[PDB]
């Protein structure tokens, strides 16, 4: 009786949280619920931080399914059992990621990242990643990936440009 | 490299890899006849290799 269900803007998604939380004890098969609403008036694109599986490329014992809009078997956007989870976009706002482990394939873990977005033309409190990306301005230096390849997180590191006058400190600036 | 990364590297169009190469850190493989026009109206490209 997992139910976590997230919603707002970015927030995480760990395997953990059903150890954490007391939900399950550690001895007996788990199936949790993650549901992901979004922010009004939005899409989501999971990504996959952390992906492994106890026992790899075995679906009967542990898997990660990302079924969107709500939980049926008609829309079943991609069930991950093998080593590696690529990135889905959703077509809703909401998602009912689970997860499945038998008692011996426990171990089996992963971490996500689900990011709210909206269609290309952009506007305030909105930033603009291509391939249909309107991220949010907070999103931009989040410390995370909240796009492809990392273009929300540029441009955000300014400490000091100098010469004798960057080391006036126990290197040289005290001989 | 571009089957695990299908929805991020092949973009759609000639005109969706010119710009990622100016906005982003990108390495389009485009064909030989179309590197020579863009690579001296733009000078910020140029041709890798053979
Ligand atoms: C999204 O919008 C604002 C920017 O206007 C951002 O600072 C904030 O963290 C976000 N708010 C919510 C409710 O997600
Ligand atoms: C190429 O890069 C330079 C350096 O910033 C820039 O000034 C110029 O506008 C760019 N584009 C050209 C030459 O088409």
Same mark, same amino acid.
């Given at each position: 009786?997992?139910?976590? +269900?997230?919603?707002?803007?970015?927030?995480?998604?760990?395997?953990?949280?059903?150890?954490?939380? +007391?939900?399950?004890?550690?001895?007996? *098969?788990?199936?949790?619920?993650?549901?992901?609403?979004?922010?009004?008036?939005?899409?989501?694109?999971?990504?996959?931080?952390?992906?492994?599986?106890?026992?790899?490329?075995?679906?009967?014992?542990?898997?990660?399914? @990302?079924?969107?809009?709500?939980?049926?078997?008609?829309?079943?956007?991609?069930?991950?059992?093998?080593?590696?989870?690529?990135?889905?976009?959703?077509?809703?706002?909401? !998602? @009912?990621?689970?997860?499945? *482990?038998?008692?011996?394939?426990?171990?089996?873990?992963?971490?996500?990242?689900?990011?709210?977005?909206? +269609?290309?033309?952009?506007?305030?409190?909105?930033?603009?990643?291509?391939?249909?990306?309107?991220?949010?301005?907070?999103?931009?230096?989040?410390?995370?990936?909240?796009?492809?390849?990392?273009?929300?997180?540029?441009?955000?590191? +300014?400490?000091?440009?100098? !010469?004798?006058?960057?080391?006036?400190?126990?290197?040289?600036?005290?001989? | 490299?571009?089957? %695990?990364?299908?929805? %991020?590297?092949?973009?759609?169009?000639?005109?969706?890899?010119?710009?990622?190469?100016?906005?982003?850190?990108?390495?389009?493989?485009? $064909?030989?006849?179309?590197? $020579?026009?863009?690579?001296?109206?733009?000078?910020?490209?140029?041709?890798?290799?053979?």
């Amino acid at each position: 009786d997992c139910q976590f +269900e997230l919603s707002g803007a970015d927030g995480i998604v760990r395997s953990s949280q059903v150890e954490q939380e +007391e939900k399950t004890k550690p001895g007996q *098969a788990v199936d949790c619920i993650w549901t992901i609403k979004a922010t009004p008036k939005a899409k989501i694109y999971l990504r996959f931080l952390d992906y492994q599986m106890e026992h790899s490329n075995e679906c009967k014992r542990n898997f990660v399914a @990302v079924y969107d809009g709500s939980s049926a078997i008609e829309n079943l956007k991609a069930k991950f059992c093998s080593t590696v989870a690529n990135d889905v976009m959703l077509k809703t706002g909401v !998602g @009912v990621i689970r997860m499945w *482990a038998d008692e011996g394939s426990r171990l089996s873990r992963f971490r996500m990242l689900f990011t709210s977005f909206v +269609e290309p033309p952009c506007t305030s409190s909105t930033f603009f990643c291509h391939s249909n990306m309107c991220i949010n301005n907070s999103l931009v230096c989040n410390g995370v990936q909240n796009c492809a390849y990392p273009w929300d997180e540029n441009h955000c590191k +300014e400490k000091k440009k100098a !010469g004798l006058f960057e080391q006036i400190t126990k290197t040289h600036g005290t001989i | 490299f571009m089957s %695990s990364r299908r929805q %991020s590297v092949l973009v759609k169009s000639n005109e969706e890899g010119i710009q990622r190469v100016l906005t982003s850190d990108y390495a389009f493989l485009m $064909e030989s006849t179309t590197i $020579e026009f863009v690579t001296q109206r733009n000078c910020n490209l140029t041709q890798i290799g053979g």
